[PDB]
Amino acid sequence: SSPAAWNKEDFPWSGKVKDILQNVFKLEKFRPLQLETINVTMAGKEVFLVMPTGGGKSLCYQLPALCSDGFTLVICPLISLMEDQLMVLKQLGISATMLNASSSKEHVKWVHAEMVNKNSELKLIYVTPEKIAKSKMFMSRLEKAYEARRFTRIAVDEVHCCSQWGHDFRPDYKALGILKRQFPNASLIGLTATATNHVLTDAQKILCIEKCFTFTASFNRPNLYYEVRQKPSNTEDFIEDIVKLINGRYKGQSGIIYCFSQKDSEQVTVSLQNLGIHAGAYHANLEPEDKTTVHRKWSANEIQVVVATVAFGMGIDKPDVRFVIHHSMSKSMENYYQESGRAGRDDMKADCILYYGFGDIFRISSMVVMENVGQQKLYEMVSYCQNISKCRRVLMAQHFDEVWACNKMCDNCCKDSAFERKNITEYCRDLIKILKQAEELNEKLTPLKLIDSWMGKGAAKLRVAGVVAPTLPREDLEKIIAHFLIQQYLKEDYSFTAYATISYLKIGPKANLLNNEAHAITMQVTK
Ligand SMILES: Nc1ncnc2c1ncn2[C@@H]1O[C@H](COP(=O)(O)OP(=O)(O)O)[C@@H](O)[C@H]1O
Ligand SMILES: [Cl-]
Ligand SMILES: [Cl-]
Ligand SMILES: [Cl-]
Ligand SMILES: [Cl-]
Ligand SMILES: [Mg+2]
Ligand SMILES: [Zn+2]
Secondary structure, eight states: OOGGGGOOSOSTTHHHHHHHHHHTSOOOSOOTTHHHHHHHHHTTOOEEEEOOTTSOTTHHHHHHHHTSSSEEEEEOSOHHHHHHHHHHHHHHTOOEEEOOTTOOHHHHHHHHHHHHOTTOOOOEEEEOHHHHHSOHHHHHHHHHHHHTTOEEEEEEETGGGGSTTOTTOOGGGGGGGHHHHHOTTSEEEEEESSOOHHHHHHHHHHTTOOSOEEEEOOOOOTTEEEEEEEOOSSHHHHHHHHHHHHTTTTTTOEEEEEOSSHHHHHHHHHHHHHTTOOEEEEOTTSOHHHHHHHHHHHHTTSSSEEEEOTTSOTTOOOSOEEEEEESSOOSSHHHHHHHHTTSOTTSSOEEEEEEEOHHHHHHHHHHTTTSTTHHHHHHHHHHHHHOSSSOHHHHHHHHHTOOOOOOSOBHHHHOOOOEEEEEOHHHHHHHHHHHHHHHHTTOOOOHHHHHHHHTTOSOGGGOOTTOOOOSOOHHHHHHHHHHHHHHTSEEEEEEEOSSOEEEEEEEOGGGGGGGSTTOOOEEEEEO
């Protein structure tokens, strides 16, 4: 059966479920798929829930824990993710606990007693997968609790960690198949955002489950406005553009500015502070006292904007973030989706504005050089930024492999423009004449040196007679070059230097298509 057969408040527990939702959790209604998942697990069946980060996966096992006898075991990979949860539950008046590496002899002792104590109101126990594999004592206590009918539910957070395709894999998650082998009458719930069908199909094998429900929430957030603007060359013109949004459309409202590095974040904060904005900086090197100060003041609306690196992300659930601005592009669409998805968690209209700058390609490419598919993921993001016709949601859905109604909620859906295919081939030939000459001279060209030569500027040795750049503005030339880069007519070449990795361009793998003199390279332009 499908999720629809389960979107129902017909069950013996439904009265109790609505009541605990509204009066213990202080939530009013269920988000998509939350009711259905709760129903399945309450019915004592196995279910995987696939739902975006910050969407409310946890509810789907915390709420059942309260509607059942005994405790729910929660397997969770990071102590910080566990500590996130326990803070929230204590504040709700819920008895929950965790066991840990650095766990007290007194505390471990107390937990063990509670598990077999028939009168316990302790309803959730969080543990790391190390506890299942490397604690004989804890497994026997689970066995006793299971036999005493006090252990009826297993939640495995981050269930994708089970698989050999899932890029946050953890060896101890391979041991977790012991849970359903030993405790077949404990129902299991698997939660993840990052779920491919063959990573899930595999985790289902690792966990020794079959059969299983799989519920997938759409990663579409209908209230989010998605935009890409040209990033300005001048860094002071860029600040002025930001301050005009913040003091105009986002006047009084909460938001985030995401930055490439810690220096960018520190710079942008100061820049805005001097211009009146209540801006605060958040990066990893910050004294953790100040990490909290900034989060505290931002969540409490004293600071209007956090100017941050990706390090501001884990466990952000502030509901009224009205804008996420990307000062630089993310490393990948997956990072973009997740970072911008921190906007508008109250489901009211919120803005996602990405500033695309040519230079950022190379700062990021260089930075992710050691990653298998780093460059390939960056280029997908660049291709999003380069798109001027296609719906932003359509481009995102192509990436998550979802079947997929924007209703004018992205910059490209609101355009009235027409478009056409401009043949830019000769421009590619011309830049390859420049690079060919450069190698015949044993010269390395950074992207700046390529653009300068094309434009008839820069060092005179690096110029090729009869090559004229068009009188298009620079960002247009930059876009033509980014196009050939991601299309691989050109390619990057890295150099590792004492302190930094830097990028140079070269004739890339697809330049041999230009041996065909009829070959055509086209780029979409406005009519
Ligand atoms: N039905 C709901 N209505 C409103 N807020 C919710 C609902 N369900 C969950 N939340 C909130 O959403 C936020 C993120 O939930 P969480 O379970 O931590 O997300 P995930 O594990 O999917 O990242 C939390 O602040 C949580 O309290
Ligand atoms: Cl996500
Ligand atoms: Cl928050
Ligand atoms: Cl077209
Ligand atoms: Cl195109
Ligand atoms: Mg979660
Ligand atoms: Zn759209």
